[PDB]
Amino acid sequence: SVQARWEAAFDLDLY
Secondary structure, X not given: OXXXXXXXXXXXXXX
């Protein structure tokens, strides 16, 4: 959720 891999990173940016 959010999107991650993106705006800085929510958390699901994967590390």
